Amino acid sequence: HHMDEEYDVIVLGTGLTECILSGIMSVNGKKVLHMDRNPYYGGESSSITPLEELYKRFQLLEGPPETMGRGRDWNVDLIPKFLMANGQLVKMLLYTEVTRYLDFKVVEGSFVYKGGKIYKVPSTETEALASNLMGMFEKRRFRKFLVFVANFDENDPKTFEGVDPQNTSMRDVYRKFDLGQDVIDFTGHALALYRTDDYLDQPCLETINRIKLYSESLARYGKSPYLYPLYGLGELPQGFARLSAIYGGTYMLNKPVDDIIMENGKVVGVKSEGEVARCKQLICDPSYVPDRVRKAGQVIRIICILSHPIKNTNDANSCQIIIPQNQVNRKSDIYVCMISYAHNVAAQGKYIAIASTTVETTDPEKEVEPALGLLEPIDQKFVAISDLYEPIDDGSESQVFCSCSYDATTHFETTCNDIKDIYKRMAGSAFDF
């Protein structure tokens, strides 16, 4: 196979981050080469089909039983995550117009674990007053808090209720409504989607905005703010490869990268199968540049096939479940996202629930037991432990722009942050929304 002599940008890997940045560069007028050493799309964020290939990948020579249904009807993302409907990832997708090729379907449910049990996440005053997450008095204080957040308007100090959005901490806002620790857990982790409680001692504006984002994103009759594509996240690399073609570039799979050529500390090209392609800038995932990354931790994901909807979700055909770390005596949250035949990722009547967390012990499977217990009985588990990498080079000098590995969260916020950060490093200014 052959390459042109020169491109503006070379992209290595077809993980989601690389595909989105490639698409932005194409729509912005760059000449892009996009390659992958693998014979399949997604990099680490790859989608497996048919089901027999999933069994083989996890070394299950027994193959799927009959009862798993038609194998070709399974599209199993290794790293499933949901999109906040009004979030910036969707805005970037719209900018590129890759959305022409995707069928997002609303995720039915959104839940949070509290004291042993899962509950619907309440984001409207009506939901607050029906919620079993809180007792009678506290749910009415929470209703008042939601009314404050909804009415808040950065340009009208009357709506601040005496808080300074730029300086009053979110801890002090919660104190204004006398919200207890359990409410703070679900609010911060399941409404605002933080990983940690660092926000508590930071100015409240960003948190208020995050809660607004949740409430404002979709619903219809009461469904979640989350989107997931029919056929799963493998539709994104496929859509981006089609978009790239329209602009004149064809994605190249099964294409080894022999060398990233550097001169005076700056990339000047890539060598592949006896040819050198020149470029001004290079985008890649960590696997292409081991000397330009450091390990940031490890994640465990357990894919669980079920023959039943998750208990206590009103028979949801898809759902988000957040397990805040303080509810389970850990230093990192546990996540479960579930998608099923309703999103055309499993055979009829089957469900895929994927549990994830950041490894903290020498028994990572044991760490996920609070999530698994919500799902039992489980037909089959598929366990994967992954190392996380982050660049130690921001590319300002090298012009080598490396992504971060995908973290344990089951939504795209931290992925979107990485994309925005890489864009800024590349362009010299922020993606202008």
Give structural notes.
The protein has 433 residues and is of the alpha+beta class. The chain folds into 3 domains: 1-59 and 226-296 and 389-433, FAD/NAD(P)-binding domain (3-Layer(bba) Sandwich); 60-120 and 297-388, Guanine Nucleotide Dissociation Inhibitor, domain 2 (2-Layer Sandwich), CATH 3.30.519.10; 121-225, Guanine Nucleotide Dissociation Inhibitor, domain 1, CATH 1.10.405. 27% of the residues lie in helices and 23% in strands. The strands form 5 sheets. The chain has a 7-stranded mixed β-sheet with strand order 8-7-15-16-17-14-18. It has a 4-stranded parallel β-sheet with strand order 2-1-13-19, covered by helices on one side. α1 crosses α3 and α1 packs across α12. The protein is globular and about 70 Å long. The two termini are 38 Å apart. It is classed as hydrolase inhibitor. The entry lists the keywords hydrolase inhibitor.
- Looking at the structure, the CATH topology of the largest domain is FAD/NAD(P)-binding domain
First and last CA, distance: 38 Å
The count of β-strands is 19
Q: CATH architecture of the largest domain, please?
A: 3-Layer(bba) Sandwich
Count of all domains: 3
Largest beta-sheet characterization: 7 strands, mixed
Overall helicity = 25-40%
Q: What is the CATH superfamily label of the largest domain?
A: FAD/NAD(P)-binding domain
Q: Identify the strand order in the major beta sheet.
A: 8-7-15-16-17-14-18
Strand content: 15-25%
- Any idea of the CATH class of the largest domain? Alpha Beta
Specify the number of helices. 12
PDB class: hydrolase inhibitor
Keywords: hydrolase inhibitor
Assembly: monomeric
Entry title: guanine nucleotide dissociation inhibitor, alpha-isoform
